[PDB]
Design a protein around this ligand. Structure first.
Ligand SMILES: *[C@@H]1O[C@H](CO)[C@@H](O[C@@H]2O[C@H](CO)[C@@H](O[C@@H]3O[C@H](CO[C@H]4O[C@H](CO)[C@@H](O)[C@H](O)[C@@H]4O)[C@@H](O)[C@H](O)[C@@H]3O)[C@H](O)[C@H]2NC(C)=O)[C@H](O)[C@H]1NC(C)=O
Ligand SMILES: *[C@@H]1O[C@H](CO)[C@@H](O[C@@H]2O[C@H](CO)[C@@H](O[C@@H]3O[C@H](CO[C@H]4O[C@H](CO)[C@@H](O)[C@H](O)[C@@H]4O)[C@@H](O)[C@H](O)[C@@H]3O)[C@H](O)[C@H]2NC(C)=O)[C@H](O)[C@H]1NC(C)=O
Ligand code: BR
Ligand code: BR
Ligand code: BR
Ligand code: BR
Ligand code: BR
Ligand code: BR
Ligand code: BR
Ligand code: BR
Ligand code: BR
Ligand code: BR
Ligand code: BR
Ligand code: BR
Ligand code: BR
Ligand code: BR
Ligand code: BR
Ligand code: BR
Ligand code: BR
Ligand code: BR
Ligand code: BR
Ligand code: BR
Ligand code: BR
Ligand code: BR
Ligand code: BR
Lengths: 346, 349
């Protein structure tokens, strides 16, 4: 809720926010895999099973096709938005990796004139840290993230907008002109606000003060467009694609094509085309008989019986048979379907 | 290819290389959509079509299931590798943004001293901390064949340098190692960066009035980021995953080469339905069956076979009673799945 304030924290939050979306997308990919498998199992079993079993599979087919189609279309819609966010967030992370290197400044040059004269060689530069970047890893401890929280989450912070010329001058005492015992120290630091401490420093230069600032906008809009890319997913309603499963009776039960095919296939009224063509109690009683009461046995029995349907199996000494669940691959299911239809032709 | 030498060039080349892989991945995704559609049409038409067409469809069906399965498995193997490359490349690109801001150094403090008192107005230059803001200037062979020989991306900046100038005496003509710092002295300290360590103090100590890098410090901004991205691109190639799902069910050459195809031609088109081996028929008879069903060498596969498949009539839901239409007019998986149920019910009835 409060803006991030360190490079390690901003990167950590931006990546954690991205994970909200990519993990949900990965769930959809897995769900599309399971729905594809389920739909293939239904078609194969619907061809191979005995009529009492076939009649229980048929009401699943149109509704399952509806779930699978929508699931694929939702993933296809989300795919470019998630890809766009990934690219933009990871580029911003790259800049944060550098802002962490600069978070302690860039060192200093300190001249100590020695005491004898004001001649100068490298040996009078006692400090020469200038150009040293910060190399330590992020602190191991540091920092509500959730899709519900995304709408008011603030932009990632820019952290550094200015570089500062730090200066110290101490004679003898304040710079009393520079003489043989004078320490002159000049450094470069960064912050998110401009600094000019010239007023206090000119009356007491023996204190390190930022005496000039220059523009150093490293992030530019990178964090803004990454932030906006996350909103683009939410605006399109693409944050949780393909969340419905064919193996969830709640998804199937709600489809009008399911109820209608219960009437056609399980209440012996095959010419029905409206939901009203049978009394609701007879639809419900048929549902109860086929799938357990209110579909309570859909997974414990219906999908188990579907998986135990025996289908043709290729073999060099002659075609054999086994169950859908034992030959659990699309190539074997497609081969069975071809073989089942050939037997009907033959 | 010589290594990249600028931040704008390194970022550009890395993204261009990445695009070689993501574009091929996108092609596989598109092919998988087309393959899923092709397979669903085949299953649907195989149930609905007249027996003459069913026999033409059945060998396409078993091969199509195999092609589609391989296609999905290739995409599943490629997906985490491509995602990793994208993440690592884009993190490196972000660092190169900053390396571009730093490519012209970070300015300087110049102190122009009548006396040797000092306030800000004696600092003529105060550019220290000024980063470079301009866009990239408006680099090389890029291609998968060229990827094995591509060098690692350049780090560009490995060290920061303290540059120093000291010019004492009127006209600022003299070195400060012999003409001590006095009222006319110009003292300039700056910060630049490069890809090599530097220590030019030996020459500077005898002539301080020339700008020289008299000290260097470590400034490794990229770390391993760019090399780790490079290695992620190689990880795709090592896995043989650069062109996943390149085969199309609508490409007869892919169908013909699928191991399931020949046997089903024998079973469905040569009146040997119990065949289980390719030796169950002469190869010449298989070829004649292929020529009759799909045109000579499959030359009519798209112009005739798939048009005939698409014109198969299937059931269509309607409130005043079930109607019929063609696969191509009812061109959606949900209408095909509904048709399959209605077809199987009709057989039951
Ligand atoms: C590209 O270079 C980057 C450095 O410029 C790499 O980032 C560094 O990666 C190392 C791991 O190899 C990290 O070291 C670890 O840090 C964690 C703590 O940091 C994490 O947790 C805190 C607290 O939540 C969080 O604020 C941070 O953002 C991190 O999420 C320690 O627990 C470990 O013990 C270990 O010390 C560095 O911290 C990390 N630096 C930064 C700035 O992220 C980066 O991994 C490189 N990229 C690739 C693709 O290799
Ligand atoms: C994050 O901030 C970055 C700055 O740190 C953004 O990058 C800058 O984006 C602008 C506009 O998008 C680019 O300006 C354009 O530059 C091109 C020329 O550069 C391109 O082509 C050369 C080859 O000629 C290639 O070497 C470069 O790498 C680029 O591919 C001009 O033709 C345009 O007219 C326009 O001036 C900057 O060049 C670019 N800077 C860098 C260092 O990339 C970046 O877009 C931000 N990220 C996001 C996601 O918005
Ligand atoms: Br995924
Ligand atoms: Br499957
Ligand atoms: Br039964
Ligand atoms: Br001293
Ligand atoms: Br009834
Ligand atoms: Br029942
Ligand atoms: Br019920
Ligand atoms: Br894609
Ligand atoms: Br489809
Ligand atoms: Br199908
Ligand atoms: Br002067
Ligand atoms: Br002046
Ligand atoms: Br290529
Ligand atoms: Br390759
Ligand atoms: Br380099
Ligand atoms: Br002068
Ligand atoms: Br490395
Ligand atoms: Br490859
Ligand atoms: Br032969
Ligand atoms: Br023959
Ligand atoms: Br034929
Ligand atoms: Br075609
Ligand atoms: Br027809």
């Amino acid at each position: 809720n409060a803006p991030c304030t360190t490079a390690c924290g901003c990167k950590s939050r931006l990546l954690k926010r991205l994970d909200l979306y990519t993990s949900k997308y990965a769930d959809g990919i897995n769900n599309e895999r399971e729905n594809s498998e389920a739909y293939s199992k239904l078609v194969t079993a619907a061809l191979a099973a005995v009529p009492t079993m076939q009649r229980k599979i048929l009401p699943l087919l149109g509704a399952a096709a509806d779930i699978l189609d929508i699931c694929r279309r939702e993933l296809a819609t989300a795919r470019p938005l998630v890809q766009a966010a990934i690219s933009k967030i990871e580029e911003a992370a790259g800049v944060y990796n550098t802002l962490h290197k600069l978070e302690r400044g860039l060192g200093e040059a300190k001249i100590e004139f020695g005491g004898t004269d004001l001649r100068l060689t490298k040996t009078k530069f006692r400090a020469t840290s200038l150009g040293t970047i910060h190399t330590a890893d992020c602190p191991n401890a540091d920092e509500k993230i959730g899709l519900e929280h995304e709408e008011n989450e603030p932009e990632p912070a820019k952290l550094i907008t200015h570089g500062h010329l730090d200066a110290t001058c101490a004679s003898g005492s304040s710079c009393t002109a520079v003489e043989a015992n004078t320490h002159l120290t000049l450094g470069l630091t960064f912050s998110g606000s401009s600094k000019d401490e010239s007023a206090t420093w000119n009356a007491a230069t023996n204190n390190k003060r930022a005496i000039h600032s220059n523009d150093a906008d490293f992030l530019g809009s990178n964090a803004t467009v990454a932030h906006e890319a996350l909103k683009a997913i939410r605006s399109a309603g693409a944050s949780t694609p393909c969340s419905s499963l064919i193996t969830d009776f709640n998804a199937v039960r709600a489809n009008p094509k399911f109820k209608l095919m219960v009437i056609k296939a399980l209440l012996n009224k095959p010419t029905a085309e409206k939901e009203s063509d049978a009394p609701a109690d007879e639809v419900n009683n048929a549902i109860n008989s086929a799938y357990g009461r209110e579909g309570s046995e859909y997974n414990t029995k219906t999908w188990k019986d579907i998986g135990s349907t025996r289908i043709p199996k290729a073999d060099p000494p002659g075609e054999k048979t086994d169950t859908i669940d034992k030959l659990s691959s699309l190539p074997q299911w497609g081969d069975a379907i071809a073989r089942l239809l050939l037997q009907e032709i033959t």
